C-alpha cells in the first residue's frame, strides 16, 4: 500500500524535477533494471513495509467530522519581503553595472586553467547578472509596496462607504415596515373586537 | 409589472381628456416620472383606480407611442454602456428602475448604475427585445 | 455543457444570473426533499440559466445530498449548504451550513 520510503529532504529537493517522458518511463521498466535503488523493488517494497508495520499496533485513521468553512472577504495585505536598501545605493549599483565599468571588470577578470578567454569573462559577466537581477527585485518590491498601500487605502474607504450606506438603507426600510405593521395590528384588533 | 403593462393601454388613449388605470405603487412612481417629464397634465389616486388627466398639443396627444421592454414574464437589465448604445440618438423617454428609484435613462446614464428597462415613451421606432 | 462567449459574458443578463447563482464559498440554498436517512438530507436548489437567443432566464432544480451532523433539517425546511470537495459514502457531497426557514413540527 505505501510508497517506498524517501526523505522529506528529497521530497522538497525534487520540487522542480520534470517527471519522466514516455521513453524515459520505458527505460525504467526494462528487465536489466540496473537503475533500481536500495529498498526500491517494485514488487516487494510495499508488502515489506506493510509487514514491518504490522509488527506494531496500527494507529487508526483520523475521525473526520465535516464542518462548513466560514466566509471571509479577501483583504489585500502589505507586501512582506521588501528589501530596505536605499534608492541611492540601487542607483550607484545600476550606474556601475550598466555603464562602461562592467566591460572593464570583465576584461580584468582573472583566468583559471582549463577555461577559454570567453568563459572567464562570461562567468564574471554572469556574476554581474546575478547582481542586477537582485536590484530589479528590490525596486519592483518597493514600488509594489507603495501601490499596495494606496490600493489598501482605497479598498478600506470603499468598504466603509458601502457598509454605512447599506446600513442606512436597511434602517429606513425597517422603520417604515415597522410603522406599517404597527398600524395594521391595531386596525385588525379593532376589527376583531 | 402587470399593472404597469395594463396602464400602458390607459395612457395610449386618444380623443380623451382623462382615462382610468389600475392602481399600484409602481404605477404611481411611473406617473410621477411622467409628470416631471411633462407628458401628462396630472393624475389622481382613487382607491383601486388612478385617473390620469392627459395632455394634448395641437389636437394630437403628447404621448405618441409606448414601447414595453420589461414584461412580468421577462426582465430586461442593462449595463451603463449598453444603455448608452440602446438609447443612442433618441429624444424619447426610457423608464428605468434601479436601486435609486424609478428614474429616466439620462439619470441612469449619468449615475452609471445598472438598471431595469421598463418602458419607452415617444421613442419612435427604437427597440431591441 | 454550455459555454458563453466573451462578449456575452459582459451583458447585464448574464452578469445578473451569474450573481444570483454565486455565493461565498460556492454555497447554495434549497429545501429538504428527503430526511429518512440519518445525518443526511436531499436538498432541491433553484438554479438559473440565461438564454441569449430569447434574452430571458429560466429556472431549474438541482438536487444534492448533504451532511447534517445533528438532526435539525426536516422535510420542507429551507437550508443553506456548502460543498465538501469529497464524497462521504456513496451519496453525500455537501454539508449543512444553516437553516433559513423551518416548517412547523408537532
Amino acid at each position: 500500500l505505501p510508497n517506498p520510503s524517501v526523505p522529506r529532504a528529497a521530497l522538497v529537493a525534487a520540487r522542480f524535477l520534470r517527471p519522466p517522458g514516455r521513453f524515459k518511463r520505458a527505460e525504467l521498466r526494462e528487465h536489466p533494471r540496473s537503475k533500481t535503488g536500495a529498498f526500491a523493488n517494485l514488487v516487494k517494497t510495499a508488502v515489506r513495509l506493510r509487514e514491518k508495520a504490522r509488527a506494531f499496533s496500527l494507529v487508526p485513521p483520523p475521525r473526520l467530522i465535516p464542518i462548513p468553512l466560514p466566509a471571509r472577504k479577501k483583504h489585500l495585505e502589505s507586501v512582506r519581503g521588501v528589501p530596505t536598501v536605499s534608492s541611492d545605493v540601487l542607483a550607484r549599483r545600476l550606474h556601475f553595472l550598466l555603464g562602461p565599468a562592467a566591460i572593464e571588470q570583465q576584461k580584468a577578470a582573472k583566468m583559471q586553467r582549463g577555461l577559454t578567454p570567453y568563459q572567464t569573462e562570461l562567468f564574471m559577466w554572469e556574476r554581474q547578472m546575478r547582481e542586477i537581477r537582485k536590484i530589479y527585485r528590490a525596486q519592483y518590491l518597493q514600488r509594489l509596496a507603495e501601490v499596495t498601500e494606496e490600493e489598501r487605502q482605497k479598498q478600506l474607504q470603499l468598504y466603509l462607504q458601502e457598509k454605512r450606506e447599506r446600513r442606512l438603507r436597511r434602517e429606513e426600510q425597517l422603520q417604515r415596515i415597522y410603522d406599517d405593521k404597527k398600524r395594521r395590528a391595531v386596525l385588525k384588533d379593532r376589527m376583531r373586537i | 409589472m402587470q399593472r404597469a403593462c395594463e396602464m400602458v393601454v390607459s395612457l395610449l388613449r386618444v380623443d380623451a381628456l382623462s382615462q382610468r388605470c389600475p392602481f399600484h405603487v409602481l404605477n404611481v412612481q411611473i406617473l410621477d416620472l411622467l409628470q416631471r417629464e411633462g407628458l401628462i397634465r396630472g393624475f389622481k389616486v382613487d382607491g383601486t383606480k388612478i385617473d390620469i388627466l392627459l395632455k394634448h398639443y395641437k389636437g394630437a396627444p403628447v404621448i405618441r407611442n409606448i414601447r414595453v421592454v420589461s414584461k412580468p414574464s421577462r426582465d430586461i437589465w442593462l449595463t451603463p454602456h449598453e444603455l448608452k448604445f440602446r438609447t443612442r440618438f433618441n429624444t424619447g423617454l426610457w423608464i428605468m428602475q434601479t436601486s435609486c428609484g424609478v428614474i429616466s435613462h439620462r439619470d441612469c446614464l449619468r449615475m452609471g448604475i445598472g438598471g431595469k428597462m421598463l418602458m419607452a415613451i415617444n421613442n419612435g421606432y427604437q427597440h431591441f427585445c | 455543457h454550455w459555454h458563453y462567449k466573451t462578449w456575452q459574458r459582459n451583458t447585464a443578463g448574464y452578469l445578473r444570473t451569474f450573481m444570483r447563482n454565486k455565493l461565498p464559498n460556492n454555497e447554495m440554498i434549497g429545501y429538504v426533499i428527503n430526511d429518512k436517512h440519518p445525518k443526511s438530507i436531499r436538498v432541491a436548489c433553484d438554479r438559473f440559466m440565461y438564454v441569449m437567443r430569447y434574452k430571458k432566464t429560466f429556472r431549474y432544480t438541482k438536487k444534492v445530498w448533504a451532511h447534517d451532523e445533528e438532526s435539525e433539517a426536516r422535510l420542507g425546511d429551507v437550508v443553506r449548504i456548502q460543498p465538501l470537495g469529497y464524497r462521504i459514502g456513496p451519496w453525500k457531497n455537501y454539508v449543512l451550513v444553516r437553516v433559513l426557514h423551518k416548517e412547523p413540527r408537532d
Binding site: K181 | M1, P72 | A44, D46
Partner: peptide
C-alpha cells in the same frame, strides 16, 4: 418579481396573512 418558484415563494412572505 419574476421567478415565483417554491423556494422563492417560501422566502417571499412577510406575514402569515396578507390582509
Amino acid at each position: 418579481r419574476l421567478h415565483n418558484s417554491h423556494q422563492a415563494r417560501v422566502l417571499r412572505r412577510r406575514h402569515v396573512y396578507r390582509d
